[PDB]
Each structure stands twice: as structure tokens, then as C-alpha cells.
Ligand binder design. Structure first.
Ligand code: G81
Ligand code: G81
Lengths: 188, 188
């Protein structure tokens, strides 16, 4: 079946409820004090984390080399506790997957698992006026409230939920290389 | 962990979306064409089952010997397909349980699993003006939309969700003896 044990270990040790001006979102912590959230959450210089207001020390809105939105935002947070390092569970490349689980941690749904089935490397998606690349698609009627939700298969964290059309769900792909300790770049 | 495989086999072979004048509800089919739904769904002489209008051949609103509401309604339906017989998974007696799962099958949520943790034999609950007996309680903030949702542990179907106060969830207890092939009683 789907890897419910796996999805549940990600949820407990690595998610938080994040609230911006836009609303609440499942937030996945990746390593240290670094986490991800969908770009359309519109992150400021502070954010609510499990209702505790938190300084956002850095926010990178990923775009690709064609200058197109990837809908992932990597955030560095001022918190005391470190996230368990889950980088080794990030896929190295674009891929297609079987039998995924979508997990949500919000106020409304502090803990919920949805098998979404087969996931496909979709590519381009118009996220309502915003061209976006590198999308994963599942055939499941996903809802508002589910954004930020973490998509797993066993041993792999593959994306975070970002959209849906009433019949399909869409996640922003997560790749390992988004998070390697890197470069000397003026980025703002 | 919680028995997610078990909860998922119940959902696939034994639930349906049921819609009355009151709205949509997860519906658990128990055996043959017999199913259950919360009494406050207010079942008529027809019901929507997976959007297909269906004759309700019989509806028994269980009450106990003190003439108090149990919040379970057993319905016999005019459908072609039989439910897999799951009576052998009904607990024989009142009990307390560990690590339960609450599963929902509605239009809004065709498939969703919520670990609710430890479940306790609660007893009396005022269901908003309706004294009700034989309630199970879990510490989980359950929501409208979840009524009818099936509460399992591994190998046991124990109740169907019927209420919640913002902090706890409440299920109507299911017992094996509710469904044994029985008696010669004028019941309406
Ligand atoms: C999650 C975002 C949300 O909850 O809105 C807060 C402002 C949305 C999930 C979608 C909504 C309906 N089903 C479903 O799975 N995502 C969206 O609505 C995106 C836009 C967005 C993404 C992330 C944060 C904020 C806003 N838009 C979208 O899905 O558009 C279509 C319908 C074209 C794909
Ligand atoms: C499910 C019923 C529903 O969806 O309403 C349709 C008319 C409700 C689940 C509750 C609601 C808020 N959280 C939660 O877990 N159940 C109720 O609202 C019951 C009444 C009811 C039960 C079943 C069918 C119809 C109506 N009432 C209730 O929970 O009251 C308190 C708050 C006192 C326990």
C-alpha cells in the first residue's frame, strides 16, 4: 500500500503550521532552521510558526533558469529547535512515482493523510496567471487548506502541494540539490 | 503505529458517500445491503448513495433500554451490489482502544485518514439538546464534514464519528450484536 508510516514520521518530526497574511499552510522543515512553503503564501519578514511569531531571516523564491516560478520558497527561521535533517530523503532527479501520500498539518487539520495514487512529472502549469515549472500531478480532488501539504512515497519526500483544479492535485517538486551547503552570491 | 492498512481496506470495500437533506456523510456498509449512518443525518425513504438516488427499505434509529438515543441508524438499501460482510470485525463489548484511525469518504474528501490516538469509553454526551449514550471519545479537534467517519484500530471497527467540541471527537459505538440475524418484531 502507500507508505503511511513514512508519511507520519515526516509529519511528526518535520512539519509545522505556518501562517502568513495569506492564511495557514503546512510547512515542511528540511534541515537545521531551514523550511519550505509555497511561494504564494507571500512570506514577509516575520511568520507565525505554530502560532508563535517568528523572524524570517531569509526567504528565497526559487525560479528556474528560464526565469519561471517554481512555487517553492526556502525560508530560514529564527527558532530555537533544529529540524531533523531530512535531505537524504529528497529525490536527486525529476521522476514519476507510485502510490504517494499527501499529508497536512494545519490548525483545521493538525494531522491528516490522503493517498493520491500515482504521481506524474507534469511540467508546466498555469497557477492562475503565474506560469510555473517542474510540477507533479496526481489524480485527486485536492482542496484549499491542503497547500504546503507534503507528498511522500516510502523513503522519499518529493514535493509540497501547491494547487488543484477540482479533479487533479499539483505539487512543487523538491530536489536534493535545492539544499546543499553552497555559494557566495548576493541574492536580494 | 495506527492500523492504516486496516482502515484503508474498510474504506475501499465498505464505504459510500450518503447524502440526505442534511448533507453528505461517510456511510459504512456492514453486511449484505445493510449500512449505518448517524441518526442526525435524518434519513427519509430515499437517500443518495454515491450520487445515485436509492430507496431506503428500512431505517432503525437505535435507542437503548433507557429510551436514550444511541445516534446510530441502521439502514437497509435497495442496491444491486452486496457489502463485504464485516460483522466479524465488530467488537463484542464496550471497550477502550489505543491508536485509532478516523477515516472519511465524502465528495469533499473521498479518502482521508486521521490518527486520533487513544479512544475512551465516554458514556453520556449531550449532542446539542439530545441526550446520547454509549459514546467513544478521542482527543482530536474533529470537524463538520467528518460525521459518519469510520473509527478503526487493527482488525476492529468500533464506531462512526458523530460529534466534537473543537477539542475532542465523539463516535457512536458499534457492537456486534447490533447486526445478528434476529427477531419477529413490529418496529415502526
Ligand atoms: C492552496 C492555496 C490556498 O489554500 O489559498 C490561499 C490564498 C490551493 C490548493 C488548490 C485550491 C483548490 N484546490 C487545490 O488543490 N492552491 C491554489 O489555490 C493555487 C494558488 C496558490 C497556491 C499556493 C498559495 C497561494 C495561492 N492556485 C491554483 O491552484 O489555481 C489553479 C486552480 C489554476 C490550479
Ligand atoms: C457532524 C455532523 C455534521 O456534519 O452536521 C450536519 C447537519 C458533526 C461533527 C462535529 C461538528 C463540529 N465538530 C465535530 O466533530 N456533528 C455534530 O455537529 C453534532 C450533531 C449532528 C451529528 C450527526 C449528524 C447531524 C448533526 N453535534 C455536536 O457535535 O454537538 C456538540 C458540539 C455539543 C458535541
Amino acid at each position: 500500500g502507500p507508505g503511511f508510516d513514512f508519511a507520519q514520521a515526516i509529519m511528526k518530526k518535520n512539519t509545522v503550521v505556518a501562517r502568513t497574511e495569506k492564511g495557514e499552510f503546512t510547512m515542511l522543515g528540511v534541515h537545521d532552521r531551514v523550511a519550505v512553503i509555497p511561494t504564494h503564501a507571500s512570506v514577509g519578514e516575520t511568520i507565525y510558526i505554530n502560532d508563535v511569531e517568528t523572524k524570517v531571516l531569509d526567504a528565497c523564491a526559487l525560479r528556474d533558469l528560464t526565469d519561471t516560478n517554481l512555487e517553492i520558497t526556502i525560508v530560514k527561521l529564527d527558532r530555537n529547535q533544529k529540524f531533523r535533517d531530512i535531505r537524504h530523503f529528497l529525490p536527486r532527479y525529476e521522476d514519476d512515482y507510485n502510490d504517494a501520500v499527501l499529508s497536512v498539518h494545519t490548525s483545521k487539520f493538525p494531522n491528516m493523510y490522503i493517498p493520491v495514487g500515482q504521481v506524474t512529472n507534469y511540467g508546466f502549469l498555469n497557477l492562475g496567471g503565474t506560469p510555473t515549472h517542474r510540477i507533479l500531478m496526481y489524480n485527486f480532488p485536492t482542496r484549499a487548506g491542503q497547500c504546503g501539504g507534503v507528498v511522500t512515497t516510502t523513503g522519499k519526500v518529493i514535493g509540497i502541494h501547491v494547487g488543484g483544479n477540482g479533479a487533479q492535485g499539483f505539487a512543487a517538486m523538491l530536489l536534493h540539490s535545492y539544499f546543499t551547503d553552497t555559494q557566495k552570491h548576493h541574492h536580494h
